[PDB]
Design a protein around this motif. Structure first.
Motif, PDB file in Angstrom:
ATOM      1  N   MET A  22       0.833  -1.192   0.000  1.00  0.00           N
ATOM      2  CA  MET A  22       0.000   0.000   0.000  1.00  0.00           C
ATOM      3  C   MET A  22       0.875   1.251   0.000  1.00  0.00           C
ATOM      4  O   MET A  22       0.615   2.189   0.751  1.00  0.00           O
ATOM      5  N   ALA A  26      -5.145   4.557  -3.305  1.00  0.00           N
ATOM      6  CA  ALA A  26      -6.090   5.355  -4.065  1.00  0.00           C
ATOM      7  C   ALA A  26      -6.836   6.293  -3.123  1.00  0.00           C
ATOM      8  O   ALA A  26      -7.133   5.938  -1.985  1.00  0.00           O
ATOM      9  N   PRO A  31      -8.383   8.392  -7.738  1.00  0.00           N
ATOM     10  CA  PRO A  31      -9.200   7.186  -7.601  1.00  0.00           C
ATOM     11  C   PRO A  31      -8.596   5.974  -8.301  1.00  0.00           C
ATOM     12  O   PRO A  31      -8.861   4.836  -7.918  1.00  0.00           O
ATOM     13  N   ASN A  32      -7.783   6.230  -9.328  1.00  0.00           N
ATOM     14  CA  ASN A  32      -7.208   5.151 -10.112  1.00  0.00           C
ATOM     15  C   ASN A  32      -5.688   5.198  -9.972  1.00  0.00           C
ATOM     16  O   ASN A  32      -4.965   5.184 -10.965  1.00  0.00           O
ATOM     17  N   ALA A  33      -5.224   5.237  -8.717  1.00  0.00           N
ATOM     18  CA  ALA A  33      -3.803   5.334  -8.419  1.00  0.00           C
ATOM     19  C   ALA A  33      -3.044   4.240  -9.164  1.00  0.00           C
ATOM     20  O   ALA A  33      -3.570   3.148  -9.372  1.00  0.00           O
ATOM     21  N   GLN A  34      -1.799   4.542  -9.546  1.00  0.00           N
ATOM     22  CA  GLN A  34      -0.980   3.603 -10.294  1.00  0.00           C
ATOM     23  C   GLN A  34       0.208   3.177  -9.436  1.00  0.00           C
ATOM     24  O   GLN A  34       0.681   3.942  -8.599  1.00  0.00           O
ATOM     25  N   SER A 233       2.361 -11.982   9.322  1.00  0.00           N
ATOM     26  CA  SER A 233       2.604 -10.561   9.508  1.00  0.00           C
ATOM     27  C   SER A 233       3.234 -10.305  10.876  1.00  0.00           C
ATOM     28  O   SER A 233       4.171  -9.517  10.987  1.00  0.00           O
TER      29      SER A 233
ATOM     30  N   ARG B  14     -16.052   4.066   0.181  1.00  0.00           N
ATOM     31  CA  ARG B  14     -15.199   3.759  -0.957  1.00  0.00           C
ATOM     32  C   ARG B  14     -13.741   3.721  -0.504  1.00  0.00           C
ATOM     33  O   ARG B  14     -13.352   4.474   0.384  1.00  0.00           O
ATOM     34  N   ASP B  16      -9.449   2.061  -1.869  1.00  0.00           N
ATOM     35  CA  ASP B  16      -8.605   1.298  -2.775  1.00  0.00           C
ATOM     36  C   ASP B  16      -8.968  -0.177  -2.651  1.00  0.00           C
ATOM     37  O   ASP B  16      -9.090  -0.692  -1.543  1.00  0.00           O
ATOM     38  N   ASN B  18      -7.208  -2.543  -3.114  1.00  0.00           N
ATOM     39  CA  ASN B  18      -6.075  -3.273  -2.569  1.00  0.00           C
ATOM     40  C   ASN B  18      -6.241  -3.423  -1.058  1.00  0.00           C
ATOM     41  O   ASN B  18      -5.775  -4.404  -0.484  1.00  0.00           O
ATOM     42  N   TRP B  19      -6.900  -2.450  -0.417  1.00  0.00           N
ATOM     43  CA  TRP B  19      -7.237  -2.581   0.991  1.00  0.00           C
ATOM     44  C   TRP B  19      -8.110  -3.818   1.178  1.00  0.00           C
ATOM     45  O   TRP B  19      -7.923  -4.586   2.119  1.00  0.00           O
ATOM     46  N   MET B  23      -3.223  -7.102  -3.320  1.00  0.00           N
ATOM     47  CA  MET B  23      -2.569  -7.393  -4.585  1.00  0.00           C
ATOM     48  C   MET B  23      -3.566  -8.018  -5.558  1.00  0.00           C
ATOM     49  O   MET B  23      -3.318  -9.093  -6.096  1.00  0.00           O
ATOM     50  N   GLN B  35      -3.004   0.011 -12.692  1.00  0.00           N
ATOM     51  CA  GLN B  35      -3.692   0.955 -11.828  1.00  0.00           C
ATOM     52  C   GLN B  35      -4.737   0.206 -11.008  1.00  0.00           C
ATOM     53  O   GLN B  35      -5.180  -0.874 -11.391  1.00  0.00           O
ATOM     54  N   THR B  36      -5.103   0.790  -9.863  1.00  0.00           N
ATOM     55  CA  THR B  36      -6.090   0.195  -8.981  1.00  0.00           C
ATOM     56  C   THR B  36      -7.433   0.879  -9.216  1.00  0.00           C
ATOM     57  O   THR B  36      -7.541   1.779 -10.045  1.00  0.00           O
ATOM     58  N   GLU B  37      -8.448   0.435  -8.473  1.00  0.00           N
ATOM     59  CA  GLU B  37      -9.780   1.002  -8.580  1.00  0.00           C
ATOM     60  C   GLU B  37     -10.275   1.397  -7.192  1.00  0.00           C
ATOM     61  O   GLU B  37      -9.790   0.898  -6.180  1.00  0.00           O
ATOM     62  N   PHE B  38     -11.247   2.313  -7.175  1.00  0.00           N
ATOM     63  CA  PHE B  38     -11.842   2.812  -5.949  1.00  0.00           C
ATOM     64  C   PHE B  38     -13.231   2.195  -5.809  1.00  0.00           C
ATOM     65  O   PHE B  38     -14.186   2.675  -6.416  1.00  0.00           O
ATOM     66  N   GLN B  78     -10.207  10.993   2.818  1.00  0.00           N
ATOM     67  CA  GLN B  78      -9.865  10.920   1.409  1.00  0.00           C
ATOM     68  C   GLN B  78      -9.642   9.468   0.994  1.00  0.00           C
ATOM     69  O   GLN B  78      -9.845   9.120  -0.168  1.00  0.00           O
ATOM     70  N   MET B  79      -9.220   8.631   1.946  1.00  0.00           N
ATOM     71  CA  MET B  79      -8.896   7.245   1.647  1.00  0.00           C
ATOM     72  C   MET B  79     -10.116   6.355   1.872  1.00  0.00           C
ATOM     73  O   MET B  79     -10.267   5.333   1.205  1.00  0.00           O
ATOM     74  N   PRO B  81     -13.729   7.576   2.226  1.00  0.00           N
ATOM     75  CA  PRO B  81     -14.887   8.469   2.282  1.00  0.00           C
ATOM     76  C   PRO B  81     -16.186   7.720   2.555  1.00  0.00           C
ATOM     77  O   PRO B  81     -16.471   6.700   1.930  1.00  0.00           O
ATOM     78  N   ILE B 231      -4.503  -5.756   7.288  1.00  0.00           N
ATOM     79  CA  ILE B 231      -4.345  -6.958   8.097  1.00  0.00           C
ATOM     80  C   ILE B 231      -3.323  -6.715   9.207  1.00  0.00           C
ATOM     81  O   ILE B 231      -2.330  -6.020   9.008  1.00  0.00           O
ATOM     82  N   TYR B 232      -3.589  -7.304  10.380  1.00  0.00           N
ATOM     83  CA  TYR B 232      -2.690  -7.243  11.522  1.00  0.00           C
ATOM     84  C   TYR B 232      -2.026  -8.604  11.711  1.00  0.00           C
ATOM     85  O   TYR B 232      -0.803  -8.694  11.794  1.00  0.00           O
TER      86      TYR B 232
END
Ligand SMILES: [Co+2]
Ligand SMILES: [Co+2]
Ligand SMILES: [Fe+3]
Ligand SMILES: [Fe+3]
Lengths: 275, 276
Positions: A22, A26, A31-34, A233, B14, B16, B18-19, B23, B35-38, B78-79, B81, B231-232
């Motif tokens: 991370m 995003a 919103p579409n972070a690369q 982790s 909303r 990322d 990836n959260w 991956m 690129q990722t999506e929201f 922002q991350m 919302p 994740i922890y």
């Protein structure tokens, strides 16, 4: 007495999110972070010790990438390895006038593709590996599991070449391999079972070879920035902090597994050695 | 006992993807800047109108979470919302079911993330049930004025000032029979420091497991299991997911995820009815 060599085994590229998880999230504004495809060094360490030559890690197999390569194409495209012939481990060792059969001990930090590539060369060595990592890799093989980091063909080679194994048990104390060479039992974290190395050189002093226990200085921090490639982790975090303590208490440098800046500043086999 | 279970819509969030799915879309050689999506997902809570007393599972986000004068930090807003109307606010959802916060006997906090522990402060007449490791973790962030994005300093502040009545689930504690056919599941560390779930045995509907963020979505659940980025304890998360799968099979229970948009649409929400 001892001489330590850093051998350049080429470079690899991958999503930075593997290295630092991370790293670039995003947002409502992006919103579409690369992500980025980052390049990092694959390397191994030779300790020419009076008691015998000790090799830490073995990099990638020369016959890994390519359409006729051991690696699956999905692996090749995710973790592409680029290396001239001079980068191959067999060659780097030859340059130092060292034959595979001269290696007494190989310490496999873990059995990922970029660390256990050339284990099959060392048929006269004792291969030291964490038992959990060994078990894990053997399972992948037996179950023909499609694990990107563990190369079916590499494992196939280890078995066929009849390597001599010495598994570090889960709750095993660190092993004194030679005067001033200690195998550190890091256990689960980045992978199933991680091994490190503490080396006490007369002149240089203390070195910890952390391997993938700590990818880079950015990983190390503080604060710690864990990878996306990770099994345990909690264990990963414990290992980093443990390394930090050992470095402090023993006044040792920490050599990360894949830090470009640090690697540049290293003295390579071609240039010389540490003593 | 003939209870009624309500799903209350407490808005949409909303973040990322990836959260949510670690991956999910790795860069490759021919796609190095992947690129990722929201992705958008629901925030919900569950009320069990039980003869022995009313039980609430999770509390959504605080009404004064978002905005310039909001409790959430800007980087948090922002991350992650949160968009919701007044009707989506828990207090309003409960009001529309003719339930006052004082009528809640037990609040089960799955964990103390911003989207689950937002409105704990309302329930000053309830026993708040939380995992001791989760409670300890949150209290540390508070005391250290740490900047963990998922833990809201102002929310915690409020819990303390409102003098909530806590019952901590100990690390090695067994399940808690909270009421007939209502059992608090001690999932332990994984997604967060200390996760609680619920098993509900309804006369008509049968068995339901509320997994909250132990299992984000059906994609998480699989098989195969696709672990999150938030994740922890990786190992604990996987053990928990496999444990839920086993419980579900053995008790013939549905598994309700924390934030599955598709599953959520299928639910009968509080504006339409309930589960008996
Ligand atoms: Co590795
Ligand atoms: Co959560
Ligand atoms: Fe590596
Ligand atoms: Fe959540």
């Amino acid at each position: 007495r001892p001489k330590l060599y850093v051998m350049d085994n080429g470079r690899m590229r991958m999503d930075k999110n593997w290295m630092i998880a991370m790293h670039n999230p995003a947002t409502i504004h992006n919103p579409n972070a690369q992500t980025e495809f980052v390049e990092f060094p694959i390397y191994t360490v030779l300790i020419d010790h009076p008691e015998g030559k000790i090799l830490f890690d073995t990099s990638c197999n020369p016959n890994s990438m390519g359409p006729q390569g051991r690696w699956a194409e999905s692996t090749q495209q995710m973790f592409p390895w680029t290396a001239t012939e001079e980068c191959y481990l067999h060659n780097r060792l030859e340059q130092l006038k060292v034959r595979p059969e001269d290696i007494r001990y190989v310490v496999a930090s873990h059995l990922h593709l970029d660390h256990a590539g050339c284990l099959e060369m060392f048929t006269n060595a004792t291969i030291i590996v964490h038992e959990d990592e060994f078990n894990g890799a053997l399972q992948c093989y037996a179950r023909n599991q499609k694990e990107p980091a563990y190369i079916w063909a590499d494992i196939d080679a280890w078995i066929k070449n009849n390597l001599q194994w010495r598994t570090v048990k889960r709750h095993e104390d660190n092993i004194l391999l030679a005067e001033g060479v200690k195998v550190l039992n890091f256990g689960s974290g980045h992978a199933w079972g991680m091994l490190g190395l503490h080396v006490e050189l007369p002149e240089t002093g203390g070195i910890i070879l952390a391997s993938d226990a700590i990818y880079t200085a950015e990983s190390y921090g503080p604060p710690i920035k864990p990878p996306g490639i990770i099994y345990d982790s909690l264990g990963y975090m414990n290992t980093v902090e443990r390394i930090r303590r050992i470095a402090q208490e023993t006044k040792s440098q920490v050599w990360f597994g894949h830090d470009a800046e640090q690697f540049k500043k290293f003295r390579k086999s071609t240039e010389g050695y540490y003593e």
